[PDB]
Task: structure prediction
Amino acid sequence: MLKGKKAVVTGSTSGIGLAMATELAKAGADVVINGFGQPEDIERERSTLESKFGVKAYYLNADLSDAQATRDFIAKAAEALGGLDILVNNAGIQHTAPIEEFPVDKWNAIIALNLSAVFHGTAAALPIMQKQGWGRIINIASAHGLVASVNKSAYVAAKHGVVGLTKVTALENAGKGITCNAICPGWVRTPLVEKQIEAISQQKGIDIEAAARELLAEKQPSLQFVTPEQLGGAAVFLSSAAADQMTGTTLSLDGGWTAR
Amino acid sequence: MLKGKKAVVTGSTSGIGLAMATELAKAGADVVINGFGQPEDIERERSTLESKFGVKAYYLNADLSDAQATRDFIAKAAEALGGLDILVNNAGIQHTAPIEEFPVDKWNAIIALNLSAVFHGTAAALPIMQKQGWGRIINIASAHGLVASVNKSAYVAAKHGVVGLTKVTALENAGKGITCNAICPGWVRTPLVEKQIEAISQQKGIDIEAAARELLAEKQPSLQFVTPEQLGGAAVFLSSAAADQMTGTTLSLDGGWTAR
Amino acid sequence: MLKGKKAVVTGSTSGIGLAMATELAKAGADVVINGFGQPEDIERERSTLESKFGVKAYYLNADLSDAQATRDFIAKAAEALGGLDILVNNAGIQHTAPIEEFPVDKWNAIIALNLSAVFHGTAAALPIMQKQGWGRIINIASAHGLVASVNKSAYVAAKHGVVGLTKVTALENAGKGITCNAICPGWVRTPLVEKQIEAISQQKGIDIEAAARELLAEKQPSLQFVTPEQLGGAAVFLSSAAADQMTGTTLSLDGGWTAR
Amino acid sequence: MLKGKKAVVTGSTSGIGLAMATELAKAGADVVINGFGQPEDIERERSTLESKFGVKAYYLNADLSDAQATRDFIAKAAEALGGLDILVNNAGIQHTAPIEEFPVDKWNAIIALNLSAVFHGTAAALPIMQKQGWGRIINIASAHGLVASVNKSAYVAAKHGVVGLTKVTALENAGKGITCNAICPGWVRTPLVEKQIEAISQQKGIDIEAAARELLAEKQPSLQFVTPEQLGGAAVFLSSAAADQMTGTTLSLDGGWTAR
Ligand SMILES: NC(=O)c1ccc[n+]([C@@H]2O[C@H](COP(=O)([O-])OP(=O)(O)OC[C@H]3O[C@@H](n4cnc5c(N)ncnc54)[C@H](O)[C@@H]3O)[C@@H](O)[C@H]2O)c1
Ligand SMILES: NC(=O)c1ccc[n+]([C@@H]2O[C@H](COP(=O)([O-])OP(=O)(O)OC[C@H]3O[C@@H](n4cnc5c(N)ncnc54)[C@H](O)[C@@H]3O)[C@@H](O)[C@H]2O)c1
Ligand SMILES: NC(=O)c1ccc[n+]([C@@H]2O[C@H](COP(=O)([O-])OP(=O)(O)OC[C@H]3O[C@@H](n4cnc5c(N)ncnc54)[C@H](O)[C@@H]3O)[C@@H](O)[C@H]2O)c1
Ligand SMILES: NC(=O)c1ccc[n+]([C@@H]2O[C@H](COP(=O)([O-])OP(=O)(O)OC[C@H]3O[C@@H](n4cnc5c(N)ncnc54)[C@H](O)[C@@H]3O)[C@@H](O)[C@H]2O)c1
Ligand SMILES: [Cl-]
Ligand SMILES: [Cl-]
Ligand SMILES: [Cl-]
Ligand SMILES: [Cl-]
Ligand code: NA
Ligand code: NA
Result:
């Protein structure tokens, strides 16, 4: 239970971050959500957190590819919550192409969101956590923060960067009651992956479910997707006392991807 | 909750394994304990599991440096419990000396217990878990399964071996409902570490608590020991549904040791 | 011997890159050098490559923090050399501060040079190497591409990014006669390190050589600096036929830093 | 050039170790060879080292699964050579089966040769190298010292053990003029692999070369075997001055296996 705790989850209007925010609210935390989407869907998500789970929930729209907007979002989030105990740096994008054709603007956008926002969000949250002597920074990296695949230069670079940044954050805050860890999922069937399944299905001339099986078989020995609910469970574990001395590390939920 | 589950923890009469067994019994599992010690202390530990937590508990004495005794211990444990759902391969020893003075018998004893028993215990448990379609094998490795320190040749070799064996076990059982993971703790103040603190205190001419602080400062950036209760919490997490797609990996609770 | 080969070394007016360029010229390669410095020193370096080693050498000034300037520098370098066989992505900067005080402009400058220039230089070189069926991309990462230290958020993030980008480049070009690898040095006594030795000497009130010994002892078990000449030797090895199937990996010359 | 140096290569009557010994003799080292095979073939190999390359060569038969025989082999080798500067711990075996069917005797034989012989050979060589202030210990691990595959429990455990032991040896000898590193090859077409190609060919009903292509495609992105000559080149590099501060690390020649 995280009763009383104050959490922020970036990129929590879809996918993994939405499940993060739900699992943290179910554990008792007040939650700031963030991300793009239809305003009616975002407001139903926010109000649902409150009416199902009895916590306070706030939506703060901020495009976290901008540094100053990210730092201002953390300040606004802490003012909404009345503190900041758990920061989940989750928002991210993907684009696939080989390096020599990889658009310069897509490199810059993926480095901006998937790596630099993690730095700016951590920098703005740390003073709050240092003053109270307790905090959790949970970065959502990927198996692609530990290994690579073709056609993902920017995203692999950024996710490896997040794993390094996680280590530095942990070391600088060692023993202060603040931990920083990176959850490294394998494939999770969110819109970010469904586009890649559709691309495989067009390339091979197969139906979408046969394409999802091919996407899994190439990388993930369990042949099953990781779920957003399992990842929410991992974030709740990282937020627990059992994880007080887990810091600076990666928690791989990847179906065996990195074991081979 | 692990209500109904049947667990075996090797080397659970002291230290980390004792806390493993307690946390699994608190979660509702029946437990087989194992290890050396005074018979009166072992029987109080066994009866305490039952009277505090309402589960069934059995002590099976087996020296797991012997292959056949390890395989026969798993069979006896499964017969006691009426199944076998969670195996925690925890028993281990240490001996410190530089390689050219490292006793051949101590190399063989640490390879036998800290590595080969993990193989023989896994081999005997897997058919039970494969027939039921569910299992957890939780190997207790170390930060010394990922990095080294001087004067620990056998133990670093064995623990690196355990991390490799964990990966193979996970891959061979991928998708079968069986996961295998290695908990990699940093320093935990058990008798295995207290001997090394006493050696530092004699080498430096300092009191025991100043020696424990020196032992921590050299390796563990948090400057705090990992606790056996935290490790029990990690084993309960690995046994949970949130960890169904966590397989073949390491879970480092090490205070930042491996981040630098 | 690399007789006939055409090499580019970024950031080769000082430090490690200067020794890279010398060792590649000694092996017989024509060399493009690059970087900042006094024009008289840069021209003596360029002319020395030609008069000592009998190769052709060119200096191309380009600030590789700019994407388009980096891509245009590779085109100009290939036009100067009449091809491009070996690209050494070496230029880099450092700045130390804890995350919450780390200047936003210094984060952006270190990501721009130490990570994004490696992407833009690789993207511009690859088509040349793909058309000829042979190439070497040698990225200069760091032990801080594998582990972290305090107060180096940007640089650790960038160097971890370089190690990930190296893997992607290798995978996308697998079997095409092109390899990509990251040399990961420990401490090398160049101006980038001498500033950090001077900071230690001021913090501790000790002379500069006692400060260099402290800098080494904290991280580098050999207690000796890695030399630029040794790193040049490693780049010549990576450029050799023995390394035709070495691709996507790290070559650590770090005095044991990453072994513990 | 290694003119004057005195080298020992275990398991050098076939495969990679034979090429190790040839490349070290070509560089000028005197060489002790070892391993099983036909006596006429072994004596032609020994005499060929001398007549082609002008060095001294000795064959010492020792089954290195026995500890005392391994330590006595190093003493005999040093007496033959008049010293011992480079030790290449190469001898190894393979056996494939899933863990629950993996023969206990095959586990013990692979741990004995592939891991414990590396310990006993290092322990016996180190005092010689420590007295002279110079040495190279080159352990032949595998990509399976860093990642796993199914059906290779013992061998993955042993090779991970070798990578850990390499780190300890490097740390204990840091700064003493002695380095220890692990060459981690991907697939090399020796008899140890040809048996696995033949097994794939029988399983799939395909000719041997189609089976070798399948074996490569599953693991090795370059789709080309690593050669024994390339590995000999890597051992000569590790023995060179450029590698004086390369210690405690892995040198992966694996065609991209570990990059993904
Ligand atoms: N899906 C997977 O298989 C997978 C695997 C490993 C890691 N991840 C990581 O998980 C994280 C979440 O991804 P997902 O799969 O849930 O994707 P998703 O596309 O479902 O969700 C991305 C979320 O980020 C938000 N977002 C996008 N751009 C933003 C911006 N500029 N500012 C603020 N918010 C922004 C989106 O609105 C959305 O809420 C990402 O970091 C991704 O890299 C995903
Ligand atoms: N204490 C630490 O800092 C630390 C850190 C990382 C990993 N570990 C690992 O944690 C595990 C438990 O160690 P601990 O610190 O709790 O040590 P401990 O000495 O307190 O407990 C070891 C347990 O193993 C049992 N045991 C010893 N030899 C046995 C044998 N031949 N057969 C059966 N049981 C045997 C002992 O009786 C005892 O129950 C070991 O694998 C150790 O390597 C410990
Ligand atoms: N010195 C070490 O201990 C050490 C250790 C590991 C890795 N490295 C890496 O080695 C590489 C070289 O560093 P060094 O120690 O030789 O440092 P250095 O400062 O001596 O040399 C840096 C070189 O980069 C050039 N440079 C700087 N900014 C540039 C820009 N915007 N565009 C083009 N060139 C630019 C400089 O003019 C100089 O030629 C860097 O990537 C560094 O991260 C250094
Ligand atoms: N072939 C590969 O793809 C590959 C890949 C990675 C690592 N390796 C490692 O390379 C090393 C050499 O293997 P290889 O492929 O050349 O195999 P190989 O079978 O051709 O050669 C093995 C050598 O070891 C000797 N040997 C076997 N048992 C011995 C014993 N008990 N005592 C002394 N010598 C013994 C053999 O006689 C032979 O000289 C092994 O450690 C292997 O694990 C091989
Ligand atoms: Cl890939
Ligand atoms: Cl150490
Ligand atoms: Cl540090
Ligand atoms: Cl496999
Ligand atoms: Na480390
Ligand atoms: Na891998």
Q: What stands out?
A: DSSP finds eight helices and seven strands in chain A. Chain A touches chain D through six residues (CB under 8 Å). Residues B 10-17, 34-37, 63-65, 90-93, 113-114, 140, 142, 185, 187-188, 190-193 surround nicotinamide-adenine-dinucleotide (ligand 2) (CB under 6 Å).
